Amino acid sequence: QNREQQEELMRDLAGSYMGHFMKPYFKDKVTGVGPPANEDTREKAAQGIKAFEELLVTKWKNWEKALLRKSVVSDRLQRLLQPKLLKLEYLHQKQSKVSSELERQALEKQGREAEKEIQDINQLPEEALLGNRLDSHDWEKISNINFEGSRSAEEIRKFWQNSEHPSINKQEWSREEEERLQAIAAAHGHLEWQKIAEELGTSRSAFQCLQKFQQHNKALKRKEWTEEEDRMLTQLVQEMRVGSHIPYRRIVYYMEGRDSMQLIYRWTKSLDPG
Amino acid sequence: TVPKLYRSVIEDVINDVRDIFLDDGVDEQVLMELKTLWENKLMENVVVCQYDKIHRSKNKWKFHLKDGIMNLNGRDYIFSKAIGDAEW
Amino acid sequence: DGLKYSLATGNWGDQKKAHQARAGVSQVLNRLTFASTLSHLRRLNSPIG
Amino acid sequence: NFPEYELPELNTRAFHVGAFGELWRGRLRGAGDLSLREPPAADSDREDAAVARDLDCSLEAAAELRAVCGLDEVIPENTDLVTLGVRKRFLEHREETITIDRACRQETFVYEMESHAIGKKPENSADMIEEGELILSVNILYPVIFHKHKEHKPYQTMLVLGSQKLTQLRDSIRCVSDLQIGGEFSNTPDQAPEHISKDLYKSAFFYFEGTFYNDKRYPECRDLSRTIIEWSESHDRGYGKFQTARMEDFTFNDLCIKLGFPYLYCHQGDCEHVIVITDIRLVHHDDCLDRTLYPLLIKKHWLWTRKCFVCKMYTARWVTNNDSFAPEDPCFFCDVCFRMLHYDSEGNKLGEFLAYPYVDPGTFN
Amino acid sequence: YQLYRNTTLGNSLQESLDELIQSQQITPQLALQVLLQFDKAINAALAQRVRNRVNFRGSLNTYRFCDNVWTFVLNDVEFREVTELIKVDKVKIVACD
Amino acid sequence: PGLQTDCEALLSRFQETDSVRFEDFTELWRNMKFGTIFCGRMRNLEKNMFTKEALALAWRYFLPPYTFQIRVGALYLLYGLYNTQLCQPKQKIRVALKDWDEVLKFQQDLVNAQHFDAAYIFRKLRLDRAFHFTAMPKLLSYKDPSDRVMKLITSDVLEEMLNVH
Amino acid sequence: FIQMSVQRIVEDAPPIDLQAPPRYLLKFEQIYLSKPTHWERDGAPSPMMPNEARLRNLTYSAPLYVDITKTVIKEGEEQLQTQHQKTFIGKIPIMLRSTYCLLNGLTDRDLCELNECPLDPGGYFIINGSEKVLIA
Amino acid sequence: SGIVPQLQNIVSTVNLGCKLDLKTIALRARNAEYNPKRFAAVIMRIREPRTTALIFSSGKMVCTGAKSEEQSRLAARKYARVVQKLGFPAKFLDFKIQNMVGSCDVKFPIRLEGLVLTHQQFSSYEPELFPGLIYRMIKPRIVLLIFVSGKVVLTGAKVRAEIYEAFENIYPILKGFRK
Amino acid sequence: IASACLYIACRQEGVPRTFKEICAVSRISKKEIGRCFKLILKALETSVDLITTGDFMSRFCSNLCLPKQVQMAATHIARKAVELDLVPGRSPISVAAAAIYMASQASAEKRTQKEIGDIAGVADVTIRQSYRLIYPRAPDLFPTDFKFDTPVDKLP
Amino acid sequence: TNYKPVANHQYNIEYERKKKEDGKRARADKQHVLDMLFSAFEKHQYYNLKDLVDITKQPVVYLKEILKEIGVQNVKGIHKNTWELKPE
Numbered sequence A: 001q002n003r004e005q006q007e008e009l010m011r012d013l014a015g016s017y018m019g020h021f022m023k024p025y026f027k028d029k030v031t032g033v034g035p036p037a038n039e040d041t042r043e044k045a046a047q048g049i050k051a052f053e054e055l056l057v058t059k060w061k062n063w064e065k066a067l068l069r070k071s072v073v074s075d076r077l078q079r080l081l082q083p084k085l086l087k088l089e090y091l092h093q094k095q096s097k098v099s100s101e102l103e104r105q106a107l108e109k110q111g112r113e114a115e116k117e118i119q120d121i122n123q124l125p126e127e128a129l130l131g132n133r134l135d136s137h138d139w140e141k142i143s144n145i146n147f148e149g150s151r152s153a154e155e156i157r158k159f160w161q162n163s164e165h166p167s168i169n170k171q172e173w174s175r176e177e178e179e180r181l182q183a184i185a186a187a188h189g190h191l192e193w194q195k196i197a198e199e200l201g202t203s204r205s206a207f208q209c210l211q212k213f214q215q216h217n218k219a220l221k222r223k224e225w226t227e228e229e230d231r232m233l234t235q236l237v238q239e240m241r242v243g244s245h246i247p248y249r250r251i252v253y254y255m256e257g258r259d260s261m262q263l264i265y266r267w268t269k270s271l272d273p274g
Numbered sequence B: 001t002v003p004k005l006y007r008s009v010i011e012d013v014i015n016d017v018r019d020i021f022l023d024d025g026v027d028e029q030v031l032m033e034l035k036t037l038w039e040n041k042l043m044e045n046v047v048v049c050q051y052d053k054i055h056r057s058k059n060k061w062k063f064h065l066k067d068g069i070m071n072l073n074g075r076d077y078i079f080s081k082a083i084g085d086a087e088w
Numbered sequence C: 001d002g003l004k005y006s007l008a009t010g011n012w013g014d015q016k017k018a019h020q021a022r023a024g025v026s027q028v029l030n031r032l033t034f035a036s037t038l039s040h041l042r043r044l045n046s047p048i049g
Numbered sequence D: 001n002f003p004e005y006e007l008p009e010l011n012t013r014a015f016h017v018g019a020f021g022e023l024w025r026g027r028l029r030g031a032g033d034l035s036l037r038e039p040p041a042a043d044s045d046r047e048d049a050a051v052a053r054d055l056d057c058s059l060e061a062a063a064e065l066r067a068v069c070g071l072d073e074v075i076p077e078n079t080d081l082v083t084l085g086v087r088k089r090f091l092e093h094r095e096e097t098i099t100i101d102r103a104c105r106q107e108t109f110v111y112e113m114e115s116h117a118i119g120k121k122p123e124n125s126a127d128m129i130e131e132g133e134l135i136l137s138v139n140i141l142y143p144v145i146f147h148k149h150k151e152h153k154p155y156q157t158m159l160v161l162g163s164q165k166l167t168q169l170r171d172s173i174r175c176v177s178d179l180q181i182g183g184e185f186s187n188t189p190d191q192a193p194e195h196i197s198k199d200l201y202k203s204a205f206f207y208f209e210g211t212f213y214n215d216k217r218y219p220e221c222r223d224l225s226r227t228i229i230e231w232s233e234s235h236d237r238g239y240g241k242f243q244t245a246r247m248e249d250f251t252f253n254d255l256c257i258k259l260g261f262p263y264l265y266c267h268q269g270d271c272e273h274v275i276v277i278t279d280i281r282l283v284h285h286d287d288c289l290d291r292t293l294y295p296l297l298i299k300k301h302w303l304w305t306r307k308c309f310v311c312k313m314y315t316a317r318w319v320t321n322n323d324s325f326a327p328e329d330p331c332f333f334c335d336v337c338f339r340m341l342h343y344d345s346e347g348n349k350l351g352e353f354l355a356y357p358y359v360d361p362g363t364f365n
Numbered sequence E: 001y002q003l004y005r006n007t008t009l010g011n012s013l014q015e016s017l018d019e020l021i022q023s024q025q026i027t028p029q030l031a032l033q034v035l036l037q038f039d040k041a042i043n044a045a046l047a048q049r050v051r052n053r054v055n056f057r058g059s060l061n062t063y064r065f066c067d068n069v070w071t072f073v074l075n076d077v078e079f080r081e082v083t084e085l086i087k088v089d090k091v092k093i094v095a096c097d
Numbered sequence F: 001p002g003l004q005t006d007c008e009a010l011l012s013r014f015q016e017t018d019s020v021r022f023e024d025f026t027e028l029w030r031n032m033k034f035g036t037i038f039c040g041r042m043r044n045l046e047k048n049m050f051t052k053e054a055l056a057l058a059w060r061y062f063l064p065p066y067t068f069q070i071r072v073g074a075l076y077l078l079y080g081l082y083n084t085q086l087c088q089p090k091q092k093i094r095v096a097l098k099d100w101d102e103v104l105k106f107q108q109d110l111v112n113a114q115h116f117d118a119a120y121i122f123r124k125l126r127l128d129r130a131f132h133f134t135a136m137p138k139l140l141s142y143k144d145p146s147d148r149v150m151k152l153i154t155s156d157v158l159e160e161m162l163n164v165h
Numbered sequence G: 001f002i003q004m005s006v007q008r009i010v011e012d013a014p015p016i017d018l019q020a021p022p023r024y025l026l027k028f029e030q031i032y033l034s035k036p037t038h039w040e041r042d043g044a045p046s047p048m049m050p051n052e053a054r055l056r057n058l059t060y061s062a063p064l065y066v067d068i069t070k071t072v073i074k075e076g077e078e079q080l081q082t083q084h085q086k087t088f089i090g091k092i093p094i095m096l097r098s099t100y101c102l103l104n105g106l107t108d109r110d111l112c113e114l115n116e117c118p119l120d121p122g123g124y125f126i127i128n129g130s131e132k133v134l135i136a
Numbered sequence H: 001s002g003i004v005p006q007l008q009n010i011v012s013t014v015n016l017g018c019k020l021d022l023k024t025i026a027l028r029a030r031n032a033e034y035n036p037k038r039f040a041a042v043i044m045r046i047r048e049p050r051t052t053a054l055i056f057s058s059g060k061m062v063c064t065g066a067k068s069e070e071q072s073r074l075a076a077r078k079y080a081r082v083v084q085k086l087g088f089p090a091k092f093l094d095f096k097i098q099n100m101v102g103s104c105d106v107k108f109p110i111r112l113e114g115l116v117l118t119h120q121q122f123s124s125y126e127p128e129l130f131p132g133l134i135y136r137m138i139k140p141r142i143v144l145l146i147f148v149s150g151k152v153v154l155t156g157a158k159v160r161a162e163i164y165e166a167f168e169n170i171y172p173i174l175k176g177f178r179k
Numbered sequence I: 001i002a003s004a005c006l007y008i009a010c011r012q013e014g015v016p017r018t019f020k021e022i023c024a025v026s027r028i029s030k031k032e033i034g035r036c037f038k039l040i041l042k043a044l045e046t047s048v049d050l051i052t053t054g055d056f057m058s059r060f061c062s063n064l065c066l067p068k069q070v071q072m073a074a075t076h077i078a079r080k081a082v083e084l085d086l087v088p089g090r091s092p093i094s095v096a097a098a099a100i101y102m103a104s105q106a107s108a109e110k111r112t113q114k115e116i117g118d119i120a121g122v123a124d125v126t127i128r129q130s131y132r133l134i135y136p137r138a139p140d141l142f143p144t145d146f147k148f149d150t151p152v153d154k155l156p
Numbered sequence J: 001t002n003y004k005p006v007a008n009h010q011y012n013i014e015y016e017r018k019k020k021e022d023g024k025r026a027r028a029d030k031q032h033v034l035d036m037l038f039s040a041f042e043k044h045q046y047y048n049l050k051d052l053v054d055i056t057k058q059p060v061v062y063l064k065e066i067l068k069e070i071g072v073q074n075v076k077g078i079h080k081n082t083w084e085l086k087p088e
């Protein structure tokens, strides 16, 4: 019995996690990859059912924004330099084997012109180098070299083009600007926010205009309770209760145009049976 | 993903050689028809790659490949890192 | 060895440079009497040169 | 077989649940301990006689034992012990640092989930659980929905009933993956909702210690474990001797498993959950005695709820990728903002985007 | 580099350049310059445009090493990309670094 | 958080009396006011968690390899703790299958030794259904011990050996 | 000399500049002195008492250490700066009954415990067991 | 005792009798490796005898990994035939077995410290450099690696009888130092 | 050759050092030091007594700030461990490091595996491997008359 | 801590890895070596044997034999006798 206890104790010393199973429960110990996706998985992907990792959203950090800016600048510099650098290399190669002098001097003059063009490109200002939030940069390279893979190419492209470009006015809104936005939304309709942003004058994205309108809107919530809505709230609460815990966020989304605070107040002050 | 990489490579090559086309004395229309011909014509299993580390055990070969394009079953695939094992 | 050699022998400068090395700076302390010990520790030398 | 520590304080050797339950019921056979009945001067004499017969003592001795061994709140607490002193100091610190001193939402939620169904008598008296039913306190690990799920793994614990056919827990595990709606509704969002993923992909399987119990109940169901078995049968993967079953001719009573060891439960193609059996115990009289609802959710993680990126008042009824308006590529919208931003006047999509119906994991799970 | 001018992309580029040469619309010097530029561009793109790991298992039939190029020939091979399986009877891997 | 220290102190103060009667345990309970260990403001969740911890610790002390005196003291501790609970659904002592033999033989020895107090306490605990007959002592996820020398050699064994010699 | 001159001498020494083209620099900043130590045959250090130096014909010397910072430039817009803390560079003979002598601040009773005469004034060096006085 | 060493490796050399162009062999062989920046030989591997051959430009081939003299000779002849099919005038001249490496287990722990103490003139035991005792047997020119686990590896022999006699000579010493 | 001669002399006089303690001083690596050591021992036709675990005890514990009591405790632990064959075929330096670690952990002055590895030039993995073999037999290796503040009855 | 025990100096392991990586210089064909020598001759009239080795990247003994076959060394009174790439 004592030696069995000792064996138990050594296997305690030789014993050993949950993480090794999580998504690939079956996985190889030489390659570390699980079994191939089931045909059901392929069919699910075909129907465009986003997986949990595909719907995973992470906030854009400030250092990420600065890294994006720097990477885009470097990308544009490289893309504008590679052509002229290659031209200069070709001119040098031709100079190496020209078998002539006057042609060699002409090639030297062309190379000097190319070097001047390269210098001009190098000293280009940041404003003219960034672009116009609609030119095609190498967004996929940024996802690999600049970013270590934490951001996909499409995510970076959308963030740069729609939000983080300098041509998007990120400054705080003004009262006159807000009033103009409200008037344009009312007259032009709340369904063409691209044309609203274009007509707003200031360089703004349709998303920003819609966000500001919603945050200052007054028809977003119903703002008045009705008997039918009260009955719906009571039924939903009685259905989704587990005791004294009433999760109002989950109740809200069966209610139309309501917030959790409104339901909390309504069920605590008026619809409470007590 | 492979078609996107091929298109990007074609665009990069065209942008890089536009200067030579302009300089040597051939119009950019020749460049455009080159791009169109390459794209149109884009439409044995061989893997062309670079080796990071070809380890050889007693009989087990472990291949660490930096990058490569493979031609499996008449379909082209791309990989930026390959960790393979084999038994001679 | 440099500091030890100079104190051990009383020659100052490197060993190879003993030609110009000052001699007698380091001497074995006189322990014949306590007065001779005190005097030796307060001794002043006037090199001729 | 006897459950014993395979690992020091982490795992138990594989044993048949049926043998374990039979052992427990035979060691308590006719002992008056497995009752499942509510707790109830004449009875004093009967109790004394029973004590005398069980302890081989005289009636007067039994009465003396009964009277002497009898049982032996108030907010004030003084003459504190070390633990009571620690509690008093903690209470004083909380009082001096807190202003409301109420149970937090998480605490009340957890308590109500744990005590949601305790002592709930059946309404029919025909679904009453037999005296001794081998309750399994299973727990299902939530999938990786948010990134931090990898670091700390949240789980939902269910008190499954022993001698209960499989596919009764599979139909009870509430996961958002079963409510996914396929297809892209970018062109028009008023399409008739496609059948939820619970209907299209009915296949699923448990994996408990080298045995794939596949859910072949319905014609639409087909072997998901076939891919894994073929993958293992390949050159060499350590795993081997995989078994197969039907999952409706087996019960938790006929299962041979370990306690605290991660097993697998796959459904909806590749949605995988870690099944861990915390402990197995005989049914008591102070817990739920029903069978209609015994696959009972004792605890759930209360996941976060995604909000519309335009307005932070509503959740995400739609997810848009490759959007020409959204800042982020995967952008979440409610119905109102999505309609106002993605359709001019009659459903003609503005710009380019791929919009899909998104069900909030924090609302339906 | 004379390695990536054998796949579908490099081959098709080779025949396209040949078609221009026989059409008297471009000179061979520009053809070879374009080929070198394509080699550099494809190398840079693959090294910087691609992020996806594959794992292949097989029974190495033969191998060969010379002048810094490995030539493996494997039989009954299976490649594993992100999620899918690709099974082939025989494959040739030409590596150079 | 100090509960183990209280349990150890109570068990030590019970053993120092060298007695098995429940009267001494009741006197110690009243003097130490151990029944107030559950007293104090604490919501139902943490209250039942603390009760679970106390019952588990008492049951652990009730099982070997502790001495007979410590085991019987832990038995009275279990009785008192379970009978004095502030939780409406009184927490139950988790009993494993591997330990059932030890507990049953301990009860048999107690009744054999005329220690009717401890036997009656255990019988009352069983009749009230205070035991959750689980598979293992604790849910699985992811002192005064007894020596073998006394079992090997003692007064009677050596007396018999020398008589034979 | 020990507290100021030695440190000033090390500080005033020009940094060592070496060119290959990788470039190497050595800068000596801080000087440390340990108490007079003697290393046994096995290599175990131990404090060296002046009487033991006299008896065993040892030199009453204290180890000298210097903090050395090395910076290397390889014309690759990278600079690596590695510091070797307390680099042994030699041993300084110690004047007895000085601030760096083991018999510093010891009371007369303590000196007698070490077989040292309290009336002994110090002010000399033990060099191979010989008491050497530096004449001004 | 009744246990005898089992040969693990046999290194032999042969003279092909003609200069070779290693580049051609590397480019035309089935399993050859040629890295002039790492070594100056062509490394060929075969499966039936499971041996590795290093082929040198001078025409001298070194075959290793064979588990028997006949297997080594057959592998060397196979390599000679392979080179012959490549268009070279390769023959089989001066075949010689240069080393015989065998392993065995006396099946009892051995006290290396005492062995080195009493056999200082032969054994060299340096735990810092190698955890095994190196015994330089003198009657046959063989070197024995002897470990505390009992494993004994004999190397440096040209004939199997040399290994057998070396093990017979060493076994009594190990038995006398049985830990 | 000079490094090998220095190592040979240190080994001969009875205060042996480790090859890593000569490599850290010389400009060559341990491999060449060992090769030249063997070559010199072969050419000179001389031999050196095998190193014992007690030879590296004094220097290792003097480089560390461990008291003399801990030094004696570690020496006794290592000697008894080698006598009891708890570390078969392992280098004496690793055994010395393990003994020093257990003596420091049990004594008032505690040292982590990193510092002991740096002082003795032994990788912490080797220290753990040599410590687990003598882990269950900690008490009987300690001196009978040994005072400590952290019980020898409980250790990492 | 001075001379704290270490198996290999960081520079020593790096140098051993670098020497194994670059490898020894191989014997290139005479024609290629000759072409490189003649091509470099245009840059400067005379070359040092050590400097010429780096440019050609060939074994010293092999390079000397090739140089002797065509080239000769002229005694210069300014620094020393150096090889002249001109055979005549």
Ligand SMILES: [Zn+2]
Pocket (backbone or CB within 6 Å): D143, D175, D176, D177, D178, D267, D271, D272, D273
């Ligand atoms: Zn699921």
Ligand SMILES: [Zn+2]
Pocket (backbone or CB within 6 Å): D308, D309, D310, D311, D312, D314, D333, D334, D336, D337, D338
């Ligand atoms: Zn919204």
